């Protein structure tokens, strides 16, 4: 299947309480492998998955210097954003950056990303074609003119198609035993009465990887969206994920409703109904 | 213009005396670095700084320190200068294009003793009569000798102004004593005019050599004159004969 | 640049020809390359940057990059004398180190119309017992070797340009403090034209 690598970087100003806090994390698919925290003591990029540990000391120095420099760059970008938006020095603000690459089943480049949001709104982003920038507003346009003059688009494209893709292959091969694994979802159903006329059926998916999953309800094979509660997919904390979908049904009609589970580790989609004697 | 500023341009110091070379840049560049350049060894990075308070070693860091407290500055610090740090140093900076632009250069000589510093002696050699008769041309040779360190600029002056046509100077000084440790240096240059021009006793030729030596601040208690930064020249007049 | 085709010493091109400096880099993670020109004892000047595969052109320079072969190269059209310099290229590390490859010394040689190779003795203007020897007017073909004797100095070759006379010439200098030293034998250890003019030291 296809794979990704992403770094998610967050700068948060805290005026009166020191320099902005900077946190960056790296992920391969749904698995974290590095972090950096400006408040942490080590002042280093740090391992967060077993397979990145085989990286020599040169790797840690290199990554450390790059991400430190970036913290300072985004620190600066926060100052510049204040000026552009004539915002006050005593208010707290956020700057997020996200970038990374996708490769397909073959391991060839597929998609690249390089994006920023300021206070949780798109500021500037590299388009999908990696050739130009989409600027949200007047401010981001000044930024765009600068980056066009310094060919950042061409540089970051070279990075996204090259180093990023090469990085991802190396990580995938090194973490082979866990990153190439697909744990199929373990399933079951629960019944909630609520009222004598109407009962809740909850459909469980447990211990699956990767996170991507689809839970869907069907009454008499009909795509249900009335009375269909869907929760966010959650981490279990062991590298697996969980999710449930729930339907409120008229009573006695349990046996006519059905839950459908699609996941990468299920060759055939699973069909579920209340089944055993009960209701 | 729009480049880095290195201070000083030239420097002689004794082994062990702490020194620091400044590098500043008012272009708001995030990236600054120091390089040395040595015959046979290429241009190599010493230390580089990708942003404020971020600092990493190059391929030749040992014996050097840096700091990056503000954006505009990147000093190169030598705690205990050693003879192997005798070299040509460049500072460089870059912004978003990631292209590094290089400062003008600091020539640093680390010497065992200031008593080893000498100004150049300079002599002009007159064109050979044989040559004028054979080629109807006439070449003067300048020789600067006995100078240490090799911190010199040679130039030719005719009739009060500097000339460039018919000139060529050695790229590199020679060592007078390839054996000796702080061997003194020699440099050569030629100026070639027509026979007729040389044969005119109205024409006046000077070979000028700027030497960079001990500053005002250096202690000197020796018989011979303090080998300060100075100019030494040699002249010739045209001759009919 | 330190491989099977490691850049080796100088490169000379006929004036007016196209210069081709093709270099190999080892690290497959190299992405951005920067060409610099450095004149002897001067600062490296940026001439060309290249961020992706292919060719880039500014006036007479073409910067080339082939990420497959791992070749980075520079082409100089219509070589001029003033193009003579060292040419350096640099790339970034995974840590933001800039690493320079093997530099290339480029000497653009002009053809010597009428080489009149000769050795002359020149007398000092004041202290006339001192003198130098001048090997001048040789072709671009001849090579000046350093001396056998340690007490005799010989300088490398050097070209001068008498602009207004459309005349260029080569020269090297030799001198020595030894009493028995003579111009006649100053260049003994060099391979010099059979035809080299050696006149009695002075004169006419």
């Amino acid at each position: 299947g296809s794979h990704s690598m992403r770094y998610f970087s967050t700068s948060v100003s805290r005026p009166g309480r020191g320099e902005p806090r900077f946190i960056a994390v790296g992920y391969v698919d749904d698995t974290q492998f590095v972090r950096f925290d400006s408040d942490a003591a080590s002042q280093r990029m740090e391992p967060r998955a077993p397979w990145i540990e085989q990286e020599g000391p040169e790797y840690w120095d290199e990554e450390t210097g790059k991400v430190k420099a970036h913290s300072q760059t985004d620190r600066e970008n926060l100052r510049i954003a204040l000026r552009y938006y004539n915002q006050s020095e005593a208010g707290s603000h956020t700057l997020q950056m996200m970038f990374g690459c996708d490769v397909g089943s073959d391991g060839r480049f597929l998609r690249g990303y390089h994006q920023y949001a300021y206070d949780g709104k798109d500021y500037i982003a590299l388009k999908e074609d990696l050739r130009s920038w989409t600027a949200a507003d007047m401010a981001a346009q000044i930024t765009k003119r600068k980056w066009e003059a310094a060919h950042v688009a061409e540089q970051q494209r070279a990075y996204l198609e090259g180093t990023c893709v090469d990085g991802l292959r190396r990580y995938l091969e090194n973490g082979k035993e866990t990153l190439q694994r697909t744990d199929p979802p373990k399933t079951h159903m629960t019944h909630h009465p609520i009222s004598d006329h109407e009962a809740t059926l909850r459909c469980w998916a447990l211990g699956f990887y990767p996170a991507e999953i689809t839970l869907t309800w069907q009454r008499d094979g009909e795509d249900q969206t009335q009375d269909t509660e869907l929760v966010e997919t959650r981490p279990a904390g062991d590298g697996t994920f969980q999710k449930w979908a729930a339907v409120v049904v008229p009573s006695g009609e349990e046996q006519r409703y059905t839950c459908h589970v699609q996941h990468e580790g299920l060759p055939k989609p699973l069909t579920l109904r209340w089944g055993s004697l009960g209701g | 213009e729009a480049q880095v500023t290195q201070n000083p341009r030239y420097l002689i110091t004794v082994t062990g005396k702490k020194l620091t070379v400044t590098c500043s840049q008012n272009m708001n560049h995030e990236y600054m670095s120091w390089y040395r350049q040595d015959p046979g060894l290429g241009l190599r990075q010493i230390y580089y700084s990708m942003n404020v308070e971020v600092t990493d070693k190059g391929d030749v860091p040992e014996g050097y320190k840096v700091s990056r407290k503000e954006k505009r500055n990147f000093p190169l610090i030598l705690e205990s200068p050693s003879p192997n740090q005798t070299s040509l140093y460049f500072c460089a900076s870059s912004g978003a294009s990631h292209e590094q632009y290089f400062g003008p250069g600091t020539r640093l000589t680390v010497t065992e003793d200031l008593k080893n510093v000498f100004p150049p002696e300079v002599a002009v050699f007159e064109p050979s009569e044989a040559e004028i008769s054979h080629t109807q041309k006439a070449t003067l040779v300048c020789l600067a000798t006995g100078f240490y360190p090799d911190h010199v600029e040679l130039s030719w002056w005719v009739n009060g102004k500097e000339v460039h046509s018919g000139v060529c100077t050695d790229p590199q000084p020679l060592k007078e004593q390839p054996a000796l440790n702080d061997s003194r240096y020699a440099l050569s240059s030629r100026l070639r005019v027509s026979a007729t021009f040389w044969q005119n006793p109205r024409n006046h030729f000077r070979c000028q050599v700027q030497f960079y030596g001990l500053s005002e601040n250096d202690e000197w208690t020796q018989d011979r004159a303090k080998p300060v930064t100075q100019i030494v020249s040699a002249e010739a007049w045209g001759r009919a004969d | 640049q330190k491989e099977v085709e490691q850049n080796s010493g100088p490169l000379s091109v006929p004036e007016g020809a196209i210069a081709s400096l093709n270099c190999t880099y080892s690290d497959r993670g190299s992405q951005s390359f920067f060409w610099y020109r450095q004149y002897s004892g001067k600062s490296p000047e940026l001439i060309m940057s290249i961020y992706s595969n292919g060719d880039k052109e500014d006036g007479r320079f073409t910067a080339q990059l082939n990420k497959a072969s791992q070749y980075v190269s520079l082409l100089i059209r219509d070589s001029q004398p003033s193009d003579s310099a060292t040419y350096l290229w640099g790339t970034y590390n995974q840590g933001g180190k800039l690493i320079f490859g093997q530099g290339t010394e480029l000497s653009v040689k002009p053809n010597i119309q009428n080489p009149d190779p000769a050795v002359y003795q020149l007398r000092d203007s004041k202290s006339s017992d001192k003198s130098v020897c001048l090997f001048t007017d040789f072709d671009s073909q001849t090579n000046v070797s350093q001396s056998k004797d340690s007490d005799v100095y010989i300088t490398d070759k050097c070209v001068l340009d008498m602009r207004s006379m459309d005349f260029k010439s080569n020269s090297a200098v030799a001198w020595s403090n030894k009493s028995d030293f003579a111009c006649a034998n100053a260049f003994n250890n060099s391979i010099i034209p059979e035809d080299t003019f050696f006149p009695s030291p002075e004169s006419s």
Binding site: G26, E63, E76, A81, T163, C164 | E30, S94, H98 | G96
Partner: peptide, 10 residues
């Protein structure tokens, strides 16, 4: 591997 982003300022 993290990208070299120096000088990429707003």
């Amino acid at each position: 591997r993290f990208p070299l982003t120096f000088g990429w300022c707003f």
